[PDB]
Design a protein around this ligand. Structure first.
Ligand SMILES: Cc1cc2nc3c(=O)[nH]c(=O)nc-3n(C[C@H](O)[C@H](O)[C@H](O)COP(=O)(O)OP(=O)(O)OC[C@H]3O[C@@H](n4cnc5c(N)ncnc54)[C@H](O)[C@@H]3O)c2cc1C
Ligand SMILES: Nc1nc2c(c(=O)[nH]1)N[C@H]1C(S)=C(S)[C@@H](COP(=O)(O)O)O[C@H]1N2
Ligand code: HPA
Ligand code: MOM
Ligand code: FES
Ligand code: FES
Ligand SMILES: [Ca+2]
Lengths: 450, 760
């Protein structure tokens, strides 16, 4: 198999024999030693590389990304951030000026993350560089550097890559995929790869029969249907957050703390849903807002409430030859709030994840849509708490009274993330949170002035 | 150019991605790759070892067992042996049992897991209570030091606070992992490795191969972070490569995968500290009785000097007329704990800080005021001594803290928080100030030495080499600045060469913050021998005294005439004068008895103070640092820019240790937090939203390299202020003592909140 791409301003044609090989490994084997390996788990951002195509330019993790995915794209690593003549990028110089490096090992990753950010005039550095771990500097000098280089024109040699092109199955369209997966039910489907590639790097697994869904535009669509928004499974979390900015600020506010920017750019909603994780952050949000899932078995097109998809741990309502096609969100959900709790705010998976969405018919609670992650082995609604809330007065004391029912709704687990007691306590904590927020009370720690 | 805020020596190379770390180095096509096969048992005898599926795994060239080792099987820096490969029995989950030599890094890793091992499990020792009950310890019984009579003082104490709290460990999480490369070179080997102590690497590799020291050469250019974790932990890999290379005939390279790295290597010693502290009616401290329960792991490593520094720093910043410490260095069937930025110091200090905080709260007094009252006295009666009997004739904390409180607007801010708290009931703010008194020097005294080698070439350029290693602390630039200052030339003329045991021998580790301190002097010595030669050459030529020959700004001046530096050197070359010189330094005034707990172990102390402000969530325990204000003493700083960097960095690491960073083992000794997904170091947004770092600018009293002070470790202790402010935030929940445990995770914060509130 043969793919092509623009590696640091020059076209490169590669003969793919091992489809599972990561972009990090390939580059370093090429002697492009500038991209570092910090963890091989998508967590630290030392391997941050800059890809470009029709969609624009973005920073991604080289260790998560597999080669076939960069076909027909413009890859720009650290050894290419500087101009052909040797002149340093505004980002690079500013880091030297503002002592943004110490040991240096995390610098290539930051420079790429900052350059890609500079290329799109993006300025939310907290969120932008959350996926970039530095253990030396305290981040303070890296912020100065970023701000100092922000008052500079974009690199033209980096913008020049835009004028490009204008063993493993790669479907162009959903039809092509549907036919193929129908005959190949045992195949390993790869969307973003931010879960699949961990099996190869950490679990040290081999994967025969592979397909790449990231080259399938009609699967990656956000369309407006009469009933709501039919969001395709190929849509990236970064994209879903961007869309939700308007219609659903609460999901967008939750997706901010989904993974990191380098992961959000390639991780998809279909991947997050088809993974079926009890700690997955997508489903608890979507279930709480009563979103419907759409499954496709070639031509077969089943529909269901998202919560019904998840049967048991490592068990989903998924037919052989059937793939997650799309979700459908309602046009509105103003009663939605989403609380993710973890040790650290950025780049840390949930211990407890509470999404609450109550309807009020003037003081009295009409509908209860309360969903949790990490409280079970499968994302589910708090049945007993929900039921015992219908018709009640919307005040703390009433909610305080129904709180114990959650201990009959869930039996939390203990591990390194949290103790079962705490998980239970924090689930009930999110209910008192929900009431206080709607009563116009200060509750969020992240919204506090220094 | 000492004092100038110049950049790091490889700043551009970092930014361009052209700086080489071990795994970046080019090496022969036949370079094999190595991986360990780890124990799945915390305490067991090995009954069966079938390595057949390992040998038959693809690409595997050699498989090694303890039996296959030609000589020494010891990697410990301690006098007590620690096997590189397990010898019939395993002592923790992750202990290397066998070594795999395969044609790729993946291949070896894959092959390592295909082991067939049978165990005869024995009872594990995982908690401190088990070790304490079963007497699983080191040094054969505890170490106890006492000054005066604590029991008598505490008996008649106007005020008293008792207490006990946990302090969790800390994984280094240097971005570049542990890594080494062995190159067989005619009878001997060359070792490239990511280590803080190349001289020990030589030592351990030599013994492993049965070679005299002059047959082993360690080169070390830069580390992608070290933080103490590379002071000894590198030994296992360098030995593995040396041994595999000897057998296979090929160059060998080994690097831990992140999960392997966190499971195998040690961490910061976690402590349980019990305290009894007593005060005056005026508020002066009478006595403090401390008990240190330290987790050392399955092996000694560097635990002995680590717990020694915990004790040495159990006075905090305060004069206590009577003080006792009881130090239990307990052995557990977990990872062998090691050095970590602060070296047991931050634990001892925090014990004193938690105690004095509790005391203050107990008598309803402002903690800041109480600490202020109980600092050591300023310079200029006989001088106060520490509990180990060392005079503190350099304590500037009274003056410093005052300055920092005014600049940070402390009193007003505190009141503003009081009001904010009383308007909120879901969110609570907290503010606290904590001081630092960190002693400087290796407590193992003979390690307080450094060497240098300087070359001046005929074109005027300079090659500078020393024993210290660059792990990102800006040591190399600092040395260049010293070298350029002494010679009277522009830093650009001075090039730093990689650390090399065949260039500068018998070096200590780059630790105890003595890197800049000692090596700086060693550089100075070598340069002054060089400057001395050229001055004497010019003097004789121009006819006058050498001390009248002036080296400055790349120019040499004598007899009203002035040459360029290069013009003198070429001339001295023609004249036949040696333009190569060594330099050597050893720290004076140092003498103390480890057992007696008496003497002068340190040359001077490094001081500082931090005011931290935070916010907590009463419902979950979620929390954020909102602002920090630091004033720190770097002496007459050698590089203010680099020094600010070190404080900003160290503070975040200190704070991080006492917040989101938490090590967790299971009921079987299996570390559960072994990936970055589970271990949570400070992320970008985690930085203080306002970060105010200012240097206390005042020369050292002792004769150190340009009156500067070691800034490497001391600012790490400033992270205590964050843990104290988190506690302060809990104090404003209810009337009860919160008893906040370290690390102060969301769960730990919620617990302490509910205690103060009195909710079960
Ligand atoms: C550093 C890091 C941080 C992370 N943080 C979070 C987090 O904060 N919150 C959270 O919820 N998750 C997090 N994750 C894990 C998360 O589940 C995935 O990263 C991502 O959401 C999955 O999307 P993907 O496109 O990468 O799926 P992939 O990795 O491509 O696939 C995952 C699984 O889903 C299957 N699959 C994918 N698409 C389909 C489809 N269309 N039809 C049928 N099957 C399909 C694949 O076969 C595979 O079994 C994190 C992962 C990493 C590495
Ligand atoms: N960037 C960076 N700074 C660092 C470290 C590190 O690994 N990286 N380690 C430290 C530790 S543990 C020590 S002992 C030193 C060593 O350098 P010095 O002796 O020159 O201060 O400073 C500290 N500063
Ligand atoms: O402070 C120290 N750091 C490292 N090693 C040591 N050995 C004695 N003291 C020390
Ligand atoms: O901890 Mo630093 O003494 O290596
Ligand atoms: S190496 Fe840490 S993100 Fe890829
Ligand atoms: S600078 Fe050393 S890791 Fe970020
Ligand atoms: Ca370590």
């Amino acid at each position: 198999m043969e793919i092509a791409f623009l590696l640091n301003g020059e076209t490169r044609r590669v003969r793919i024999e091992d489809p599972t090989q990561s972009l990090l490994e390939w580059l370093r084997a090429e002697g492009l030693t500038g991209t570092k390996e910090g963890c091989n788990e998508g967590d630290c951002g030392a391997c941050t590389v800059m890809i470009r195509d029709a969609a624009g330019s973005r920073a991604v993790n080289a260790c998560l990304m597999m080669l076939p995915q960069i076909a027909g794209k413009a890859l720009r690593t650290i050894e290419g951030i500087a101009a052909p003549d040797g002149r340093l990028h505004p980002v690079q110089q500013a880091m030297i000026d503002h002592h943004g490096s110490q040991c240096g090992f995390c610098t290539p990753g930051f420079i790429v993350s900052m350059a890609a950010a500079h290329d799109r005039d993006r300025k939310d550095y907290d969120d932008l560089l959350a996926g970039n771990l530095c253990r030396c500097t305290g981040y303070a000098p890296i912020l100065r550097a970023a701000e100092a280089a922000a008052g500079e024109p974009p690199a033209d040699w980096l913008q020049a890559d835009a004028a490009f092109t204008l063993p493993a199955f790669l479907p162009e369209t959903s039809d092509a995929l549907a036919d193929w997966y129908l005959a190949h039910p045992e195949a390993t489907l790869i969307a973003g790869g931010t879960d699949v590639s961990l099996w190869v790097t950490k679990a040290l697994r081999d994967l025969p029969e592979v397909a790449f869904l990231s080259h399938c535009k009609d699967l990656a669509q956000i369309r407006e249907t009469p009933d709501g928004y039919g969001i395709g499974a190929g849509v990236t979390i970064a994209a879903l957050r961007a869309f939700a900015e308007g219609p659903h600020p609460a999901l967008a506010g939750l997706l901010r703390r989904f993974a990191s920017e380098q992961v959000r750019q390639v991780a998809t909603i279909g991947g997050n849903i088809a993974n079926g994780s009890p700690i997955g952050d997508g489903p608890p949000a979507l279930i709480a807002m009563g979103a419907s899932l759409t499954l496709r078995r070639g031509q077969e097109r089943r529909r269901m409430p998202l919560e019904d998809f998840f049967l048991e741990y490592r068990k989903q309502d998924r037919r052989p030859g059937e793939f997650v096609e799309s979700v459908t969100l309602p046009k509105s959900a103003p009663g939605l709030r989403c609380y993710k709790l973890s040790k650290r705010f950025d780049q840390d998976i949930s211990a407890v994840c509470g999404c609450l969405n109550l309807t009020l018919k003037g003081s009295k609670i009409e509908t209860a849509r309360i969903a949790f992650g990490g409280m079970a082995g499968v994302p589910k609604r708090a049945a007993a708490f929900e039921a015992a809330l219908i018709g009640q007065d919307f005040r703390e004391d009433t909610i305080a009274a129904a709180l114990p029912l959650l201990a009959q709704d869930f039996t939390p687990l203990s591990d390194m993330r949290a103790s079962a007691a705490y998980r239970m306590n924090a689930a009930q904590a999110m209910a008192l949170r929900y009431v206080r927020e709607l009563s116009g009370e200060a509750v969020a720690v992240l919204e506090v002035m220094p | 150019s000492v004092g100038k805020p110049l950049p790091h020596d490889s700043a551009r190379a970092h930014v361009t991605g052209q700086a080489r770390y071990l795994d970046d180095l080019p090496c022969p096509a036949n370079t094999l790759h190595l991986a360990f096969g780890l124990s799945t048992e915390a305490s067991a005898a090995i009954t069966g070892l079938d390595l057949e599926p390992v040998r038959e795994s693809p690409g595997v060239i050699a498989v090694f067992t303890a039996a296959d080792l030609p000589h020494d099987n010891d990697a410990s820096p301690a006098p007590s042996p620690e096997p590189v490969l397990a010898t019939g029995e395993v002592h923790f989950v992750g202990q290397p049992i066998f070594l795999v030599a395969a044609t790729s890094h993946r291949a070896a890793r894959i092959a390592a897991r295909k082991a067939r091992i049978t165990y005869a499990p024995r009872p594990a020792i995982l908690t401190l209570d088990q070790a304490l009950a079963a007497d699983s310890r080191f040094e054969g019984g505890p170490v106890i030091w006492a000054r005066g009579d604590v029991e008598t003082a505490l008996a008649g104490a106007a005020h008293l606070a008792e207490g006990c709290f946990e302090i969790g460990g800390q994984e280094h999480f240097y971005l570049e992992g542990q890594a080494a490369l062995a190159l067989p070179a005619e009878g001997g080997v060359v070792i490239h490795c990511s280590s803080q102590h190349p001289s020990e690497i030589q030592h351990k590799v030599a013994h492993a191969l049965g070679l005299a020291f002059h047959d082993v050469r360690v080169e070390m250019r830069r580390m992608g972070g070290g933080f103490g974790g590379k002071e000894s932990q590198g030994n296992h890999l360098a030995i593995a490569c040396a041994v595999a290379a000897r057998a296979t005939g090929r160059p060998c390279k080994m690097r831990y995968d992140r999960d392997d790295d966190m499971v195998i290597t040690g961490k910061r010693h976690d402590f349980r500290i019990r305290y009894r502290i007593g005060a005056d009616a005026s508020g002066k401290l009478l006595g403090a009785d401390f008990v240190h329960l330290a987790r050392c792991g399955w092996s000694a490593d560097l635990s002995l000097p680590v717990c020694d520094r915990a004790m040495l720093h159990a006075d905090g910043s305060y004069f206590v007329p009577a003080l006792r410490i009881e130090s239990h260095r307990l052995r557990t069937n977990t990872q062998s704990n090691t050095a970590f930025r602060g070296f047991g110091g931050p634990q001892g200090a925090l014990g004193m800080e938690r105690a004095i905080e509790h005391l203050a709260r107990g008598m309803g007094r402002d903690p800041a005021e109480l600490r202020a009252l109980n600092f050591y006295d300023p310079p200029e009666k006989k001088t106060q001594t520490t509990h180990y009997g060392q005079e503190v004739a350099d304590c500037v904390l009274g003056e410093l803290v005052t300055r920092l409180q005014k600049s940070a607007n402390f009193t007003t801010r505190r009141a503003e928080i009081a009001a904010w708290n009383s308007t909120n009931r879901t969110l609570a703010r907290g503010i606290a100030l904590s001081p630092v008194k960190f002693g400087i020097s290796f407590t193992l005294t003979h390690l307080n030495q450094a060497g240098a080698l300087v070359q001046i070439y005929t074109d005027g350029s300079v090659a500078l080499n020393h024993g210290g290693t660059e792990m990102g602390q800006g040591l190399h630039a600092k040395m260049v600045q010293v070298a350029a200052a002494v010679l009277g030339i522009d830093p650009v003329q001075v090039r730093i060469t990689a650390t090399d045991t065949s260039k500068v021998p018998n070096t200590s580790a780059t630790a105890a913050s003595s890197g800049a301190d000692m090596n700086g002097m060693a550089v100075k010595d070598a340069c002054e021998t060089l400057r001395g030669r050229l001055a004497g050459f010019v003097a004789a030529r121009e006819g006058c005294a050498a001390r009248d020959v002036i080296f400055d700004a790349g120019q040499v001046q004598a007899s009203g005439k002035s040459w360029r530096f290069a013009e003198i050197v070429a001339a001295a070359y023609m004249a036949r004068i040696s333009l190569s010189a060594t330099g050597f330094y050893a720290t004076p005034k140092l003498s103390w008895d480890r057992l007696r707990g008496q003497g002068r172990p340190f040359l001077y102390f490094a001081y500082g103070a931090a005011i931290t402000e935070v916010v907590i969530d009463r419902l979950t325990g979620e929390n954020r640092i909102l602002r920090t204000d630091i004033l720190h003493d770097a002496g007459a700083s050698l590089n203010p820019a680099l020094d600010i960097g070190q404080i900003e960095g160290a503070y975040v690491q200190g704070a991080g240790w006492l917040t989101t960073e938490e090590l967790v083992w299971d009921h079987c000794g299996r570390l559960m937090t072994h990936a970055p997904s589970t271990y949570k170091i400070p992320a970008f947004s985690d930085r203080p939203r306002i970060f105010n770092v200012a240097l206390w600018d005042q020369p050292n009293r002792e004769e150190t390299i340009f009156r500067s002070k070691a800034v490497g470790e001391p600012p790490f202790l400033l992270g205590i202020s964050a843990f104290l402010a988190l506690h302060d935030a809990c104090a404003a929940c209810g009337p009860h003592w919160p008893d906040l445990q370290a690390p102060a995770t969301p769960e730990a914060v919620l617990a302490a909140v509910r205690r103060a509130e009195g909710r079960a």
